[PDB]
Each structure stands twice: as C-alpha cells, then as structure tokens.
C-alpha cells in the first residue's frame, strides 16, 4: 500500500518526505503516466508503473479487491535495507517487490527539480 511504499523510500532516503518529493515529477512519478520519461528518475517510475500493471495481471491479485495502492503487505527497514516478508501471500509479495525495486532505483539516480510539477504538455 501507499504508506508502505512511503516508508520504503524513507528507508533509503531518510531526509525525504516521498509523498511530497517524488510525487508529480516528470511524466510518470505520480498517478497515471504517459509519454517518454524525462530522466532516469522518471524512468524508475515508469518501471514501477509497469510493475503494478503486471501485478494486476496475476491471478492471485484478481481474487482480492485490494488495489496496489491500498493493499497492505509486510516488510521491514533495517540499517537502511528493505526486506519483503515471507509472510506475504502471492499478490502482496509481488507488489512488495515492485515497491522495493523502485525505492532502490530512486536512491541511485539524480533528482532534477526542473522536472518537478512538469507540464503534461511534455508527456
């Protein structure tokens, strides 16, 4: 769910408030997404978006009404390391992995403020 993803990013980037810093960035970081990614951070979000779409393709997810944004899963942050729990069932485990990969991706690429609140005209 959104609140777990928020925590994962903070696990990797302790100085940020992810829901503020990484929302409405480029063409993909935020609700929806289209066009060509503007930079590598934006590409991280495109990959994350594709991961969520793939998750909704799984038979294990189409059984629950929980949406990737509201579906809770278990994970831990320890020494700034993210670990998805084995207690997670099929759907939750896939989502957890999508989020973990994105959080790590976010922490490895440059952040370009020029792309914040980008005009959808570019997407």
52 binds Ca ion (CB under 5 A): no
Residue 30 Cβ vs Ca ion, minimum distance, rounded to whole Å: 5
Give me 59's structure tokens.
């038979």
28 binds Ca ion (CB under 5 A): yes
Q: Please say whether the dihedral angle defined by the alpha carbons of residues 9, 10, 13 and 19, taken in this order, is positive or negative.
A: positive
Task: Select the residue whose beta carbon is closest to Ca ion and give its number.
Answer: 33
Count of residues engaged in binding Ca ion, rule: CB under 5 A: 3
User: Does 48 participate in catalysis according to the annotation?
Assistant: yes
Identify which range of 1-9, 33-41, 85-93, 108-116 contacts Ca ion by CB under 5 A: 33-41
Q: Which residues bind Ca ion (CB under 5 A)?
A: 28, 33, 49
């Amino acid at each position: 769910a959104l609140w777990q993803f928020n925590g994962m990013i903070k696990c990797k980037i302790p100085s940020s408030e992810p829901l503020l810093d990484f929302n409405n960035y480029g063409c993909y970081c935020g609700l929806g997404g289209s066009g060509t990614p503007v930079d590598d951070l934006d590409r991280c979000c495109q990959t994350h978006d594709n991961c969520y779409m793939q998750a909704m393709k799984l038979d294990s997810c189409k059984v629950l009404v929980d949406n990737p944004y509201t579906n809770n899963y278990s994970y831990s942050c320890s020494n700034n390391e993210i670990t998805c729990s084995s207690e997670n069932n099929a759907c939750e485990a896939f989502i957890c992995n999508c989020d973990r990969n994105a959080a790590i991706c976010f922490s490895k690429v440059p952040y370009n403020k020029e792309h914040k609140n980008l005009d959808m005209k570019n997407c």
